[PDB]
Structure 1
Amino acid sequence: QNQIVSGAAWTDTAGNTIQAHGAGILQVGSTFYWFGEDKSHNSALFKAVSCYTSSDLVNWSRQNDALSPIAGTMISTSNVVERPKVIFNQKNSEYVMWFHSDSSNYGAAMVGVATAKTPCGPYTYKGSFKPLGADSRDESIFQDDDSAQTAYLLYASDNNQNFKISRLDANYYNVTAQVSVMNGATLQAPGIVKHNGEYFLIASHTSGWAPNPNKWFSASSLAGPWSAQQDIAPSATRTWYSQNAFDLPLGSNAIYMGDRWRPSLLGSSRYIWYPLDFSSGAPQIVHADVWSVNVQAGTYSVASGTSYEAENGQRGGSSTILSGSGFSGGKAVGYLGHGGTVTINNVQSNGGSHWVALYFANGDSTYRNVTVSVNGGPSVLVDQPDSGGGNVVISVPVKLNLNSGENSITFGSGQSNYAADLDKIIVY
């Protein structure tokens, strides 16, 4: 049944908001382990490397925290611990965790290591350092599938200007040699997945918390040469408002796992997971608002839903129709909220709880929100991130309770702040 619904608030088996940002994924046997920053405290300072497990990548269960602060050290609560990655060391039968270990102004620019014999740990800190003497901020660990299972650190170096790939020693404890450097790449948030014997690097450019168009690069060796940057998503959408975290191989394709960073409320940062489809020979995000993964078969199924054009709705109050090449049908409804509404009618449904995808444009740099009322019911307030332009449409999901047969859905009523411009909705 379960569904990967990007943008919705995800909850563990305990009903608590998952707090595993900067995802790192490890698969011991039939269990998946998801590692991330715990951001419960709405701050970038360190609180925990969390630990969640699952058997099918949707139903997650929060274990003990795999790494926890230590006062007077550099994994203390005055420091920063980002993007935990974990591979398994066959030789030592040992789980080695890498992370970006830094100071609160990111001037320290180090890696940190920790080990444990249990996948979810807890892990003991072995210390932090500059890899081969150089800056390391955003990083990732690639485990090759050669016989030695050689591991590589991927990291943004020299104040994020030069992207580097270096080989890990046979213990995964330190870096033995450089392999590759892209000078002036200003790449961060890296991941690598190996597909058809070719290495694909995925990475953001550097733009603070602001999402930018993430890029793919390929090479037949980790040393290179690497292809020039290409898009994994439509450029205007800024990776569908997200930033790469982990790229997990899945059958003959992969899953793109990104974070939607909310700097002003970091705990509430969302998880953006999409099929990464290689049918063209290269990774492309499949913009699936709702989709399912069958891990055992390495397949994904993209749920198909029904589109309703916001402009075919019934406007109320001071809402308007707007025109733009970014809108589906060429139109959207503006001036929603602050006295303007639109009701979408004859939304057909077998009844129950249905994921509905609100397609909108938000030209501001800050969040808006919209009220959503089904058949005159009490409204839920749905968040609307900055979209990248009044002509750029991304989508957020809201789970709604419909009746069998004909429903209505009302946007913008009972809110004094303007909402974002509604392009359409897709009822799954």
Structure 2
Amino acid sequence: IASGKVWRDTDGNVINAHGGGILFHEGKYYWFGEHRPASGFVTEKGINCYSSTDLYNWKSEGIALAVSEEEGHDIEKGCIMERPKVIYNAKTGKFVMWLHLELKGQGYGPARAAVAVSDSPAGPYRFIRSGRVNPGAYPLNMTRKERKMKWNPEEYKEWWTPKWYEAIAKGMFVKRDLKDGQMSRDMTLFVDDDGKAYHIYSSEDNLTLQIAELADDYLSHTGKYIRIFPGGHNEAPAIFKKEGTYWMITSGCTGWDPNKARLLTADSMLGEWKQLPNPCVGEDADKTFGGQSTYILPLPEKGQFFFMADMWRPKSLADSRYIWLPVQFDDKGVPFIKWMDRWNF
């Protein structure tokens, strides 16, 4: 595992799986990610999939979720498809893919999460629906008093004033988006011990993280959700659970530029969360080693976890590389990550 180098599949082609994540099923790891083009930023293809027995040799499984050729479809060619994650639904036996969708020709405005389904890990997946999250429902931890407040859009046009920040903290953008549902851009998924799944996403114009419970088949949301770190600008969330504790690594919001990772922790997924120091340590840790969090893969057979990131090259996004590093734990059980040029499982 040689972070930042050109990685190739078994045919010799550059692995094209960005913003991704990995699952294990029937003896194989399946890596899902954005198919990025050589020029431009929008996918020409959809969500790509690769498979491996060993986490070193990756076989191209082809496109798992394709862009549609039908005009007016939510996922017609030219839509934005980012940060795909796949989870297995044990009750129905289906593979469920969620992803950040922006409708074609609308930039990043729609701020939707989309959901697709497959009988097999590699696909093809069948698109079901897209939309903002939980129309009509308030966050669980947004208080009665906060829900009763009125925010005149004309008084709060200037971002980053003291009164605007306070307003964002007390849920001004939640109320703004209440009817049509909460915004979802950068996102991930987590399947808990009891089969409860959660959709974690940057919401409220990227200012605030939200964690939403998924329904029992993982195809919709239940209405139950919380919001955390309002105004915190936590992006590209990555999550894992260890010995009952939930840990989340995120980035800041500086477009393509690498920035300082944050470490967030809770004892309950929908309980209170708190922020801990940058979990990256050593030289370049202030820049997350030139990367941005995408996924934390548990290896539950070994009681270990590994941190996946993207080393984004905005000049040509197909040339973006992959940083994969062991998650280590200090004497208090707090995760940290150090660079290694080459390491083995």
TM range (shorter): 0.7 to 0.9
5+ unaligned residues in a row in structure 1: which ranges?
A: 294-428
Q: Which amino acid aligns with 1:85?
A: K
The secondary structure found in structure 1 opposite 2:289 is helix
Alignment of 1:24-43 (within 5 A): 24-43=21-40
Q: Which amino acid aligns with 2:60?
A: R
Q: Which amino acid aligns with 1:151?
A: A
Deviates more, 1:41-50 or 1:10-19: 41-50
The secondary structure found in structure 1 opposite 2:315 is helix
Contact 1:84–1:99, Cα closer than 8 Å, also in 2: yes
Contact 2:21–2:297, Cα closer than 8 Å, also in 1: no
| Greater per-residue strand proportion | 1
Shift of 1:79: 1.0
2:50 is matched with which residue?
Answer: 52
Shift of 1:52: 0.3
Alignment of 1:391-410 (within 5 A): none
Matched, 1:265 2:316: yes
2:17 is matched with which residue?
Answer: 20
Q: Which amino acid aligns with 2:315?
A: S
Contact 2:38–2:319, Cα closer than 8 Å, also in 1: no
Deviates more, 1:96-105 or 1:175-184: 175-184
Contact 2:246–2:266, Cα closer than 8 Å, also in 1: yes
What CA distance in whole angstroms lies between the structure 1 residues aligned with 2:307 and 2:324?
A: 5
CA deviation map 1:262-299 (0-9, x unaligned): 11100000001111112441221121110011xxxxxx
Q: Which amino acid aligns with 1:139?
A: M
Q: TM-score, normalised by structure 1?
A: 0.65
Shift of 1:33: 0.3
2:197 is matched with which residue?
Answer: 151
Matched, 1:169 2:220: no
Shift of 1:236: 5.3
What CA distance in whole angstroms lies between the structure 2 residues aligned with 1:236 and 1:171?
A: 39
What CA distance in whole angstroms lies between the structure 2 residues aligned with 1:237 and 1:204?
A: 11
Matched, 1:245 2:247: no
2:89 is matched with which residue?
Answer: 89
Matched, 1:292 2:289: no
Q: 1:176 to 1:227 in 2, by over 3 A?
A: same
Higher relative contact order (CA 8 A, sep 6+): 2
Matched, 1:136 2:165: no
1:74 is matched with which residue?
Answer: 74
Q: Which amino acid aligns with 1:261?
A: W
1:221 is matched with which residue?
Answer: 268
Shift of 1:256: 0.5
The secondary structure found in structure 2 opposite 1:248 is strand
Q: Which amino acid aligns with 1:275?
A: P
Q: Which amino acid aligns with 2:326?
A: P
Q: Which amino acid aligns with 2:274?
A: S
What CA distance in whole angstroms lies between the structure 2 residues aligned with 1:236 and 1:259?
A: 14
Matched, 1:205 2:267: no
Alignment of 1:295-334 (within 5 A): none
Q: Which amino acid aligns with 1:262?
A: R
Q: 1:192 to 1:236 in 2, by over 3 A?
A: closer
What CA distance in whole angstroms lies between the structure 2 residues aligned with 1:286 and 1:185?
A: 25
After the TM superposition, list the runs of 4 or more consecutive aligned residues in structure 1 that deviate by more than 3 angstroms. Answer: 234-237
Shift of 1:229: 3.5
Q: 1:184 to 1:109 in 2, by over 3 A?
A: same
Question: Aligned match of 2:235 in 188, 197, 222?
Answer: 188
The secondary structure found in structure 2 opposite 1:238 is helix
What CA distance in whole angstroms lies between the structure 2 residues aligned with 1:19 and 1:236?
A: 25
Q: TM-score, normalised by structure 2?
A: 0.81
CA deviation map 1:103-156 (0-9, x unaligned): 45211100011101011000111121111111000000001112xx11000000
1:255 is matched with which residue?
Answer: 306
Contact 2:327–2:337, Cα closer than 8 Å, also in 1: yes
What CA distance in whole angstroms lies between the structure 1 residues aligned with 2:265 and 2:9?
A: 35
What CA distance in whole angstroms lies between the structure 2 residues aligned with 1:261 and 1:96?
A: 26
Q: 1:236 to 1:249 in 2, by over 3 A?
A: closer
5+ unaligned residues in a row in structure 2: which ranges?
A: 135-180
Contact 1:114–1:124, Cα closer than 8 Å, also in 2: yes
Contact 1:26–1:87, Cα closer than 8 Å, also in 2: yes
What CA distance in whole angstroms lies between the structure 2 residues aligned with 1:41 and 1:68?
A: 18
Q: Which amino acid aligns with 2:207?
A: Q
1:369 is matched with which residue?
Answer: none
Q: Name the count of aligned residue pairs.
A: 288
1:342 is matched with which residue?
Answer: none
What CA distance in whole angstroms lies between the structure 1 residues aligned with 2:273 and 2:223?
A: 18
The secondary structure found in structure 1 opposite 2:223 is strand
The secondary structure found in structure 2 opposite 1:292 is coil
Q: Which amino acid aligns with 1:129?
A: G
Q: Which amino acid aligns with 2:76?
A: S
